[PDB]
Design a protein around this ligand. Sequence first.
Ligand code: DMA
Ligand code: DMA
Ligand code: CA
Ligand code: CA
Lengths: 328, 292
Amino acid sequence: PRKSGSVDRLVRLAEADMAGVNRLITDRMQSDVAIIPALAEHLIAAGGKRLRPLMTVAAARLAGADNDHFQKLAAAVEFIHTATLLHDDVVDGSQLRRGKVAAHLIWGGAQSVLVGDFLFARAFELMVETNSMKALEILARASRVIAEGEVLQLMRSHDLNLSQAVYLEIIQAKTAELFAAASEAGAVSAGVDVAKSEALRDYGLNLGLAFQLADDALDYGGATETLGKNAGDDFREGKATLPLLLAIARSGPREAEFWERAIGRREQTEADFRRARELIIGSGALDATLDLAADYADKAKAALAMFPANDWREALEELADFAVSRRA
Amino acid sequence: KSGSVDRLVRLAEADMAGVNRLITDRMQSDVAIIPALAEHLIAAGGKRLRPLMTVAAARLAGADNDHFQKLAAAVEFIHTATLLHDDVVVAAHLIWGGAQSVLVGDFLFARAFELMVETNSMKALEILARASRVIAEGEVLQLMRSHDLNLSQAVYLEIIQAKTAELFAAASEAGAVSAGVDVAKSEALRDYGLNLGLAFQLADDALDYATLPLLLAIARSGPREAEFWERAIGTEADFRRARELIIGSGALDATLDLAADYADKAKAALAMFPANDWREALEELADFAVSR
Ligand code: DMA
Ligand code: DMA
Ligand SMILES: [Ca+2]
Ligand SMILES: [Ca+2]
């Protein structure tokens, strides 16, 4: 049995920096156009684990930063994340996010998209203030790669003959890259050698793969009330993810017409989800997904080998295990 | 006094070829539908006014370097991204093709900033990041006032300044700063772009006869019984009734003249620059914004 980890040590070590990050967040979500801070705070104040800014903070302190200018980057990262949520929820048609109704059901799809565009621009304004051209290139690139991954998913995730390799390419782009960017931007703020920033980048990329694999498994195996979003969104969208792909592969010839109807032609009821959830758990497909996630978590922990075994390093190792073990 | 758009287009030929090559190259992805969907909007737009601003401003400010071409291309990406996020349509779910438009928009927005990073110009990035922010505020404001019967002239101007003119101003200002000129020079060129943007929009509002002409007519056709009465009707049979209220109250004429005032302001902003082909082409453009 693998270690649980936790976020607790990370959160506690980063407390003094996150108060600065949260101050920037509340500040930059402000606008004279009143819908903007209303829509934004509905999402931001609703909750969220803040893992991405936490990783920027952790990476900066592990790399030994001498000022706190990384806090603006951490704030920018959360805005980028927040914006991608607004856009992704509109695209996927999801009804719940962080325990609240998805913003686009209250303010409309257009306003959700536009407020996302606001946050994206606010994120770059913040980065400009830090004067770190390298950190700005890192997050500009990450943001482009997210969009590419989302398009790739839109084009290719909606048929059952999706390969594992294309799936891993999608999750690397749409999810793991922002984690890699968050750590790498944190590291470059500190003004370090490329070996350290590359190591931290490596940590975040692998953490994000583990993270997304666990998220995909949680979509079938989690409870809506702990997740803050509807279990079964992927299935009801007709979106193939690894747990589904692996389950199809163990299922034999007898289930092929069920998937074809529910996913390929996308004809569904609520009963189809309960049937799918059972076939994903029972076939061990959920477990195999998490085995792969744990493999990526090991890679994330090994990526930090060059760093001193201090509290920041231990916090990041515990986060790697947490990425796989978490329920939300 | 007519002017042209054609004079600047011809002057900016050698520069715009390099801009269009950057535009084509940077829109590419290993994800095939991204450049396919982007080229549909880009190549079938024709005019390229916003990147022209950047080319023209950098040339008038006497740029020795090449950097403005990447900023010009980035400006077109931002412009295209904003167009992609407009057609999206409480309207909860996306129209067909809406999903790709959101995400290709996100791609181009991000590509623009990558392109700008390549110039190493932190001032240019600052200008365009702020522009992007203001545009997004302008677009949110327009949508929360899309219904509005009683929208004042001032607030409408604030909307179009943010959602249309700001990009023209930012394109010009960014072009100027890539030339390495002083603040007075970049400020003037910024002002040219801003006023030009306003002049284009207001004449476009006039060339269509919830814009300024209708807003003025309703404000000049008395209180709530041709205000809320027109707003309740706000079809094709119902059209020429409000047009009569537009012309007859002198609202269409008030729009055209305001448009011209903005064009003159644009021209007056260029007065510190040498009276050369670039300046005269920009002067002619300001007149074109009104005549066309
Ligand atoms: C890509 C992905 C799974 C996004 C949701 O992120 P998260 O689980 O970190 O969300 P939150 O910020 O709400 O904790
Ligand atoms: C915002 C983003 C990059 C989402 C991708 O992952 P997902 O659709 O699995 O996330 P969620 O389940 O949080 O909607
Ligand atoms: Ca989603
Ligand atoms: Ca998910």
